[PDB]
Amino acid sequence: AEAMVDLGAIEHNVRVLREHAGHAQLMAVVKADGYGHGATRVAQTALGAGAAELGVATVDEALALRADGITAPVLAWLHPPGIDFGPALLADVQVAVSSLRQLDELLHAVRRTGRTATVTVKVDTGLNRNGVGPAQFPAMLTALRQAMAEDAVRLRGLMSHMVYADKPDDSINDVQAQRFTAFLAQAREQGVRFEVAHLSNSSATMARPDLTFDLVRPGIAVYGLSPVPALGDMGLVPAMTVKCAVALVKSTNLALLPIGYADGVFRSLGGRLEVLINGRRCPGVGRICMNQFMVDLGDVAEGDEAILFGPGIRGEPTAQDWADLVGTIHYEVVTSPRGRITRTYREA
Amino acid sequence: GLLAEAMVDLGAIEHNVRVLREHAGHAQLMAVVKADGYGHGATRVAQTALGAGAAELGVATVDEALALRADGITAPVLAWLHPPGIDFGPALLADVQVAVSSLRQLDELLHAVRRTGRTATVTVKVDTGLNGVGPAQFPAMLTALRQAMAEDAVRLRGLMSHMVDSINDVQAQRFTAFLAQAREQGVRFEVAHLSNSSATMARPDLTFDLVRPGIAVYGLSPVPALGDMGLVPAMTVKCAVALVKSIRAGEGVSYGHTWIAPRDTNLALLPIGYADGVFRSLGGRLEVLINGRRCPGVGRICMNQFMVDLGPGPLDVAEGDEAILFGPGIRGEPTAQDWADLVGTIHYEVVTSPRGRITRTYREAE
């Protein structure tokens, strides 16, 4: 079994996203090991296709990209209490801070390493998770101005998280942008200029160009998965195809597929999913086991290829179809395949 | 792993193996460590189970068996799921026992015996109602094994089947018929085994020479309706609290704002999500244990984080404090079975889920 990532599709999706972003620079989001597609290979491909920067949640993710030889800018924005920012600084990793405590921790690491931090501030425009709130932003701006005066930080970015990953027309997107503009006015009042400001995820990138600031941060759309499923594929091509070989044929006629829920085939797909074998759809029957399940063939031989999901070009189910059956989202579908499902690549 | 961990208590594994050996009576135990030890770590659990009296190990694939061998495991290892056209040579050269479930597979194994010159320690997997050799094909299987055994191409170690209520008695009766058909055709196996964890613990009258528990080794109940059956779940999934914050009544939480605070309250941010194995459908249903108190999840589970409600009572949580998502339940935390109930699955799938930011760690047995 394998989870075949078509880097040609990644490259195509990156090119589509850049058309929508217009003059804005694109930050390809490759957290969670490239949403299960492989952070390093997707990153290399996106940068080749015109992405300017990479975005990840954790410094650990950023250090992994650096260790694989990535030299492009990388921004990390989720830091657990206790983190040592020193390794990030020595590896030229940009850090988004979301509290004065995080800033103070970063500054101690700047003095320790002797390395000026390229810093972004993450503010709360409505998600209400971890961004700096409006009342705390002035104090943060003052501390940043002081630190920048002593050449301890370079003030690169202002960023915020969108509330809706898939609801572009909701006026909360417009509200969050108005709130973001207000934060920028607060900075002006404190004599601070950020190099760039960014709020857009994939949904906002493709559908709200009127809310684009200096950079866009698409993730899901890089992998070809529609950020607004009710609109169809949005001209993207899902990059991941999950397939496995028929391990046994047994008589109707059934095929044994040797992957199961420990490999990420959601157990709740039992008796509901279909797979594509030699052009035809074959429904799963019976439970998904830990490492195998059966499908009903109703012209198939041991070793033949069964496709569980993909872009849909050959009539195979899509990750969205799995999301529909399971009651989830394709984000969770593509971060599931593992174990016996080996990640592979189709070169572009 | 500082951020989050799936901590496996090897003292619990030892206790569970001891319990299983008690139930197995005179029979020996094959501890089943397929799927990287049901998410607990095949090698570490294998080492601990053998040290607690397990006689042998069971896995699905030869690849799993080779991984144990490469980590220095020398005990017997049996593999029973093989892709068509497998070259059994490496298994024979690594002293991996092979269970065959078809005549075609036996032919593949006997070819590998001819190519390598290594006798195979063979087990036949028969179909008692569940793959497997069927009654129709078994007479031809026995004639061939008698032939291979006479030239010492194989050592005839095992006869096995897998259990799929009187249906249990029916499979056992079919299994005994296989043993009789082999005995009357003069083909003797060293050992016969039918029993998984459920049979081992609940149907001792159906114990043959060996039992093959998996799930109960990890302390998870093989008959959940009967309770913990004296076993202790070995996996505890826990994470450090990354942020504590206050919110006002009326404020939304997490992507989509699917939860609106009915009152001013305090929340904690736990930095693991569905890409780490926290099923997204647990959103708004699961509870965590923090400093002895249950805290419900609020809002959607995100890719790598979610939020829990600490309540508006005096704050008793700090950043860096420990949140327990599930465990054996000794401290009042949820169990893997609780998760299985909430999302409509089985604990087998729960414990094979944690990954990503959830680092597997080990507590040594005292």
Numbering used by the authors:
A (entry chain B): 14 to 264, 283 to 329, 334 to 383
B (entry chain A): 11 to 140, 143 to 176, 183 to 384
Q: What wording appears in the published article?
A:
Comparing wild-type MtAlr to the D322′N variant, we observe a clear conformational change in the orientation of the N322′ side-chain with respect to the wild-type D322′. In particular, the χ1 angle changes from a positive value of +60.3° for D322′ to a negative value of −69.7° for N322′, as measured in chain B. Interestingly, a χ1 value of ∼ +61.0° is statistically observed in only 10% of the aspartate side-chains in crystal structures compared to a 51% probability of a −71.0° χ1 value. This less energetically favored conformation is likely to be induced by the electrostatic repulsion that a D322′ with a χ1 ∼ −71.0° would experience with the nearby fully conserved aspartate D294′, due to the short distance of about 3 Å between them and the absence of neutralizing interactions. The abolition of such repulsion in MtAlr D322N allows N322′ to acquire a more energetically favorable negative χ1 value. Therefore, rather than being oriented toward PLP and W90, like the wild-type D322′, the N322′ side chain is oriented toward D294′, with N322′ making a H-bond to D294′, at 2.99 Å. As a consequence, although the water molecule (w1) originally bridging D322′ and PLP phenolic oxygen is structurally conserved in the variant and still makes a hydrogen bond to PLP, due to the longer distance the H-bond to N322′ is no longer present. The interaction between PLP oxygen and Q323′, mediated by two water molecules, is maintained in MtAlr D322N (not shown). The crystal structures determined at high-resolution identify a change in the orientation of N322′, as compared to D322′, and the loss of a strong H-bond, as the likely cause of the observed lower affinity of MtAlr D322N for DCS.
Alanine racemase (Alr) is a pyridoxal 5′-phosphate-dependent enzyme that catalyzes the racemization of l-alanine to d-alanine. Alr is one of the two targets of the broad-spectrum antibiotic d-cycloserine (DCS), a structural analogue of d-alanine. We demonstrated that Alr plays a central role in DCS resistance in M. tuberculosis, and identified that mutation of Asp 322 to Asn (D322N) confers resistance to DCS. Kinetic characterization of the D322N variant showed that this alteration reduces the affinity (Ki) of Alr for DCS 240-fold.
